Design a binder for this molecule. Sequence first.
Ligand SMILES: CN1CCNC(=O)c2cccc(c2)-c2cnn3ccc(nc23)NCC1
Ligand code: NA
Length: 329
Amino acid sequence: KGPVPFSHCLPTEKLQRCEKIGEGVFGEVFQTIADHTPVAIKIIAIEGPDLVNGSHQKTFEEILPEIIISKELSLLSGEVCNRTEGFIGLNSVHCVQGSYPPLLLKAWDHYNSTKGSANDRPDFFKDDQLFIVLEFEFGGIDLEQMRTKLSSLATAKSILHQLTASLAVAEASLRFEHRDLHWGNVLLKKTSLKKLHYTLNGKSSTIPSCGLQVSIIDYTLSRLERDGIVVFCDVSMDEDLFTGDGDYQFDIYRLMKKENNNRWGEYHPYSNVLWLHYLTDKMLKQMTFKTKCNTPAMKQIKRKIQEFHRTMLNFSSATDLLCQHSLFK
Ligand SMILES: CN1CCNC(=O)c2cccc(c2)-c2cnn3ccc(nc23)NCC1
Ligand code: NA
């Protein structure tokens, strides 16, 4: 009924196998192994007065939405009327108190030496410092890092279909908007399954996998509701979020604000359409595939994704796209 030491969710063998896999202003992400199974560990400092990576730490009340949303989206894998495995599984959440473990600093240093880091080395925390530690299913590697690694546009089709179906199921169940679905937040992992299964308002269907399973991650800007209680991040007074340039990504923030009149509590599932447009645009303009569309059935797939790009902004939600767009028939 209070915070635990780091050793409670990272016992020695688990800590000794941690390798850093990513980062952001929020904190750090590590991969480790327990019971022969990889997991991802997201660690966020809270409640303290130090700047961390140049920003103030969130309070407990500010981090709660991400926790709540992570649980609700994970639970969709085990539901019936609205079921999807397209989010990321959540194994546990803990509030931990202590300085940063030396073994994690070792992992942090290895990443800095090999990939380079934009973050402060997290060695300045005292023994009273609080963190949230979220343990997730390991979802693979992000779409951005797989820019030059995918087989063909047929794989792109499967990825867009999986993302649209996931978002639709979450719309139907939870009035969900992701609100930050840039290509760093789309994970890809190998699957031996030929087709993946979802259920939308009691109607089940399948999606050819092309050998990959997609997981949507990072709920820090997300919104949902149950029984009229809305859980979200109020960015109405954020300046910086809306003044980016150099990528279509930064236009999506501005376009969301236009759609919702700067009222972030409301439900505007058109934001999911905007993100899927951004992702479709990446598929066609920045992704590069090992095999180009050199045949007829493939040249048809290409034309259909091009048609999706130029028509999808005329749909009202991911649900509308899934149920009505020709790409998915
Ligand atoms: C820096 N990261 C962006 C912010 N992370 C999250 O919000 C987050 C949330 C839940 C799970 C994961 C990540 C997660 C699960 N498997 N995995 C594989 C690669 C990976 N992250 C993850 N790379 C780091 C990307
Ligand atoms: Na999942």
